[PDB]
Amino acid sequence: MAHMERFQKVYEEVQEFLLGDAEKRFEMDVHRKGYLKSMMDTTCLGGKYNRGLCVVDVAEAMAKDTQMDAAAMERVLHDACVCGWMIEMLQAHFLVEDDIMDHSKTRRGKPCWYLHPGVTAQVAINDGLILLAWATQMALHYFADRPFLAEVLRVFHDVDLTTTIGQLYDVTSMVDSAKLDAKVAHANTTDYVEYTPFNHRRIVVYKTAYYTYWLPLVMGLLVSGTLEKVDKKATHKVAMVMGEYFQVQDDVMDCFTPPEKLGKIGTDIEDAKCSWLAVTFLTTAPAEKVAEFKANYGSTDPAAVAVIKQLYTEQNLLARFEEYEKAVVAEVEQLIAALEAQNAAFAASVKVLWSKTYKRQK
Amino acid sequence: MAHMERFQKVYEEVQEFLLGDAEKRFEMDVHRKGYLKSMMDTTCLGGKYNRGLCVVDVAEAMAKDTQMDAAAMERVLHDACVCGWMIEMLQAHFLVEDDIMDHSKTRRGKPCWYLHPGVTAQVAINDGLILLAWATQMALHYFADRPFLAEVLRVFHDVDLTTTIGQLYDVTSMVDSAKLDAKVAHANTTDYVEYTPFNHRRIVVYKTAYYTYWLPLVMGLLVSGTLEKVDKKATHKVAMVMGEYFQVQDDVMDCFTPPEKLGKIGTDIEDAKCSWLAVTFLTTAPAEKVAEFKANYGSTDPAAVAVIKQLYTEQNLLARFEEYEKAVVAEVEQLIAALEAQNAAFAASVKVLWSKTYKRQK
Ligand SMILES: CCCCc1ccc[n+](CC(P(=O)(O)O)P(=O)(O)O)c1
Ligand SMILES: CCCCc1ccc[n+](CC(P(=O)(O)O)P(=O)(O)O)c1
Ligand SMILES: C=C(C)CCOP(=O)(O)OP(=O)(O)O
Ligand SMILES: C=C(C)CCOP(=O)(O)OP(=O)(O)O
Ligand SMILES: [Ca+2]
Ligand SMILES: [Ca+2]
Ligand SMILES: [Ca+2]
Ligand SMILES: [Ca+2]
Ligand SMILES: [Ca+2]
Ligand SMILES: [Ca+2]
């Protein structure tokens, strides 16, 4: 990828800064510095970098569009890389915490951070908090003299909030909402009445679309000083459409993509998650198959999980996804075409992001 | 307390805003809104409000020392209350997450948030993240057009990082630092060689002093526009001394204050914490008593805990605290006197904070 080498160079730069700053400010000792280095490397590296690299792709596109000279271009690319790492560390934070919340086993082809024997969930929770803090530290340091610092902080923290609310929807989705009461436990649902297209859309847009699609695009515009050049509503709309689709893919892959290819072991079925598969099945399957689903879903029994997979297969869920995908392609293309009529350079950068999303395999 | 009524009024305002903003932005439903209200009330209320009220005390002191109209004074006080609630919500965040990490039972006289039956650790982790996000939301909304927004965000997030690093020191203080390795599980220390005055100070300064003493003072100065009228270095120093002392008090009370008076059940002894009591004992007790301490410390067995408490009593640790406290008083009064010679208005607000700290019983 065009910016991978530069992006990785900036990682090393940022890591040196952050660890050195802890030495300077907090009397950080050699052993804990090494621990934090290993923590950062394990939690921030090994993903696809779609979010971080998007910031750079957008920033470059807009820098070229606005005819920046050699020096201005170099600054924008470095700033874009720093913003990219802000999002990658936000991602790192989210995944650390989520892997604890989901009690998961693997991430990016390695054990989950909390499952490293010298870590445990009780230390890992705080390691996740360090990651989130570091993200803001990068902005405060690298963008101290940039008027765009304020807007970077605003969008970043708005998106942090958004994702945590999306997560709230996700973690509370398998209990009937009228029964959500801190003082009273309640079993997972038996009737699945709340497993609706509306509720699935709400979970995925807030937990995924804002930080995975909207944030990278906006940060790229902010660092290049070109936010005013594009249609705010249109940009938001296309980010939501792609982001929803991205999470749908993730949902489909939970069941149908081998864990060794995916790099993680999802447990959506045994955890009774309101996934795209569950919602699409429940709303389209004949009554006797819905009965079978309800009798098997949300069970850790490997055979019960297999029953659900079989039900999904026999209900042609993959074909139904293919049809959903065709509708998404059409809408995304319409939205990009409209963006292109306003600013072609930005529209092309959305196309780049879309191309890395459409029909991805992991 | 002079500003308690105003401070509580602002809580209700801020809560209405935050919950209303979730309805507007995230399609928040009535049930989860209710959940979030109960979460906010349980995690943010019921404490002493020393941090939040400090912001208002400082801001008022400094605003009175400037000549400003009734409208301007009202604005400073309201902004101060919002800043105070930022810190109280940061506190709320820290305690939610720490109670999970320490696997604790009670907080402010009620079950810990994660221990509420309808919550659990796997939901509460995210509830803590929402709290942290909300703190920044308050600044972004209430201070959208204030000159101090940028500096408020900078200090708040610097202190957030600081505290997470302090927490790192805390959670890893029971294992020999050379053995800290993510890949390898290691037993807690058996020799306690790193339970030193330096290492205790390092834990308490970063995990407590910055957010409990430094941050409230600085926020009060920022919202009143008076940060440049005070000695930065001297303000930092007095905050560190008082904060260290505050945490030492907390450590002492873990062992010696009834949990019903304290409002929480500490497990420092059971969890082999590098507390002030442990360090003071290990550095002052005769060799055979040190040996007996090592044999009994870090054990959940009631008899072993009882042995430690008796050893502490026999080593006169309470009396040793009183001597430490006398030394702290002497230093603080000297530092305050120096501050008073420079800015008497600010020095008075430091005295208010110190008076709530010195010889507190919970
Ligand atoms: C505030 C925490 C956000 C956590 C978050 C948001 C979106 C996706 N994930 C991780 C995925 P996965 O674990 O990567 O499959 P999910 O568990 O399916 O949602 C985590
Ligand atoms: C980043 C998490 C900070 C957690 C944090 C910082 C300072 C004090 N506490 C709580 C106290 P306590 O639980 O109130 O006694 P500690 O466990 O003694 O340290 C928690
Ligand atoms: C599905 C979501 C939103 C979490 C994982 O995101 P990615 O699939 O982008 O993970 P990495 O490339 O960062 O590993
Ligand atoms: C010891 C620390 C730093 C955690 C508890 O702080 P407080 O004793 O100030 O708790 P509340 O008043 O907020 O309950
Ligand atoms: Ca997960
Ligand atoms: Ca999850
Ligand atoms: Ca998933
Ligand atoms: Ca603790
Ligand atoms: Ca604790
Ligand atoms: Ca304590």
Nearest-neighbour CA in chain B from A332: distance (Å): 22
Resolution of the structure in the document, Å: 1.8
Strand partners, B110: B107
Among B280, B278, B275, B313, CA closest to B293: B278
Q: Any CB–CB contact under 8 A between B178 and chain A?
A: yes
- Name the 3-class secondary structure at A107: strand
**Contact assignment for B101 to A183 by CB distance below 8 Å:** no
Angstrom distance (rounded) from CA A252 to CA B309: 57
Which of B 201-220 lie inside 8 A of A, CB atoms?
202, 206
B254, B268 contact by CB (below 8 A)? yes
Nearest CA in chain A to B121: A101
- Ligand 3 centroid–CA A203 distance in Å is 16
Cα A117–chain centre separation: 26
Solved how? X-ray
Show Cβ contacts of residue B16 under 8 Å, excluding neighbours closer than 6 positions: none
Show Cβ contacts of residue B204 under 8 Å, excluding neighbours closer than 6 positions: B166, B243, B244, B247, B248, B251, B276
Residues of the domain holding B332: 2-362
What phi and psi, each to the nearest 5 degrees, are found at residue A124? -60, -35
Angstrom distance (rounded) from CA A146 to CA A144: 6
Nearest CA in chain A to B95: A126
- Give the residue ranges of the annotated binding site of B for Ca(2+): 98, 102, 170, 250-251
Residue B192 maps to which CATH number? 1.10.600.10
- Name the 3-class secondary structure at A285: coil
Name chain B contacts of A157, Cβ cutoff 8 Å.
Answer: 133, 136-137, 140
B206, B166 contact by CB (below 8 A)? yes
> Which residue lies with its CA nearest to atom 16 of ligand 1?
A98
Q: Any CB–CB contact under 8 A between A13 and chain B?
A: no
Among A10, A84, A78, A83, CA closest to A47: A84
Query: What is the number of structural domains in chain A?
Result: 1
